[PDB]
Amino acid sequence: QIVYKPVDLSKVTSKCGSLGNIHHKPGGGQVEVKSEKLDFKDRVQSKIGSLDNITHVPGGGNKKIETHKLTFRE
Amino acid sequence: QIVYKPVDLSKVTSKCGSLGNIHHKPGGGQVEVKSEKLDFKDRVQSKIGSLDNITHVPGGGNKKIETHKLTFRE
Amino acid sequence: QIVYKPVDLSKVTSKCGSLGNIHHKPGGGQVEVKSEKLDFKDRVQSKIGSLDNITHVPGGGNKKIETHKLTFRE
Amino acid sequence: QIVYKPVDLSKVTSKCGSLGNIHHKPGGGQVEVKSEKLDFKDRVQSKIGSLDNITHVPGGGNKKIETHKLTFRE
Amino acid sequence: QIVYKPVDLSKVTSKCGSLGNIHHKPGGGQVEVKSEKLDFKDRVQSKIGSLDNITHVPGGGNKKIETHKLTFRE
Amino acid sequence: QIVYKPVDLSKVTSKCGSLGNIHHKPGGGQVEVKSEKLDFKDRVQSKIGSLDNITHVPGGGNKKIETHKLTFRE
Q1: Rounded distance, CA B61 to CA C12, Å?
Q2: Which residues are glycosylated (chains A, B, C, D, E, F)?
Q3: How is B35-68 classified by DSSP, letter by letter?
Q4: How far apart are CA B2 and CA F26, in angstroms?
Q5: Which of A4, C38, C63, E10 is deepest in the core (most CB within 10 A)?
């Protein structure tokens, strides 16, 4: 006889009274990338020559990440 | 006999009273990328030569990610 | 006997009282990408030479992602 | 007797065998000017809040600036 | 008797065999000017809040600036 | 008797075999100017809050600046 029975009552929470004056003012920039040959093979994630500006202001940014297994000889 | 019964009553939650004055003002930029040959093979994610501006302001940005398995060889 | 019966009553939720004054003002930009030959094969995602502006302001951006398996000799 | 007789045989000259490969690539920009009240009076030259790009490529840009007076009790 | 007779036989000159490969690539930028009340009066030259890019490539940029007076009380 | 008779045989010159590979690549920047009240009066030259890029490549940049006077009280 085999049993898998985790029991979860968990809480992942936030309370913000007001999320206010966020100012993002990037002053430009210069990016130069040089290469000859690019090979990418199998599951590569690649980012070349970028001038990216991100403002990310979630009213709550909460992550719950879980993984569960019951495995017989994987 | 085999049993799989994870039990979940969990909460991933937010409360924001007001989400307000987000200003995003990128000042331009310059990007120059050089190459000759690109090969990409199998599951590649690729980003070359970019000037991307993102504003992301969700009233709640909460993420729950789960994975469950009951496996006899994989 | 084999049984798979995970039980989920879980909540992924938000409340934002007001979602307000988002200002996005990109100041232009310059992007120059050079290459000669591109090969892309099997499940590739590619983004080459871009000047992209995204405003994303969901009143709730909550994400729940699940995967389940009951697997016999994959 | 009064005699004003200046003599000019002078030369202001150039040769360029060729005037060639000139690249101007401004990467954008952001300008913000704030004020309430403007009182420009008498012979004012003014520029406010500008993002100007000039390419100026004269095959000869030679300047002679000259000025003569014969003046009795100005 | 008064005799004003300056004599000019002078030269202001150039030779360039070629005037070639010139790149101007400004990477953007951010300018913020704040004020309340501006009172420019009498012969003012003014520039406020500028992001200006100039390329100036004359095949000859030779300047002669001259000035003559014969004055009996200014 | 008065005799004003300067004589000028002068030369201001240049020779360049070629005027070649010139790169100007400003990497952006940030300028913030704050003030309340501005009172420019009489012959002012003024610059406030500037992010200016100049490339200046004259095939010859030669200046002659001259001044002649015969004056009975200026």
Answers
A1: 10
A2: 41, 47, 63
A3: -SEEEEESS-EEEEEE--EEEE--S---EEEEEE
A4: 68
A5: E10
Contact of chains C and E by CB distance (3 or more pairs under 8 angstroms) = yes
- Strand, coil or helix: A16: strand
- C-alpha–C-alpha distance, residues C64 and B10, integer Å: 13
Size of interface C-D (CB pairs under 8 A): 14
> What gap in Å lies between CA D1 and CA F3, rounded to an integer?
12
Sheet holding D70-72, edge to edge: D70-72, E68-72, F68-72
**Cβ–Cβ contact E28 with C under 8 A:** yes
- Are the C-beta atoms of residues E28 and A29 closer than 8 Å to each other? yes
Dihedral sign (CA D68, D70, D74, E2): positive
Cα nearest neighbour of C43 on chain B: B43
CA distance D50 to E51: 6
Nearest to F54 by CA among B11, E37, C70, E22: E22
Give the single-character DSSP code of D19.
B
The number of beta carbons lying within 10 Å of the beta carbon of residue F58 is 24
The approach used to solve this structure was cryo-EM
Could you tell me how far CA A72 lies from the centroid of its own chain? Answer: 31
β-partners of residue A55 are B55
Cα separation, E59 vs A71, whole angstroms? 79
What does residue E10 show for φ and ψ, rounded to 5 degrees? -75, 165
F35 and chain B: CB distance < 8 Å anywhere? no
DSSP D1: -
* CA–CA distance, A56 with A71 (Å, rounded to integer): 39
How far is it, in rounded angstroms, from Cα B56 to Cα C63?
14
Residue F74 to residue F71: CA distance in whole angstroms: 6
CA distance A46 to C35: 17
CB contact burial B4-16 (16+ within 10 A = b; e otherwise): bebebebbbbbbb
Residues 6+ apart with CB under 8 A from D1: E1, E2
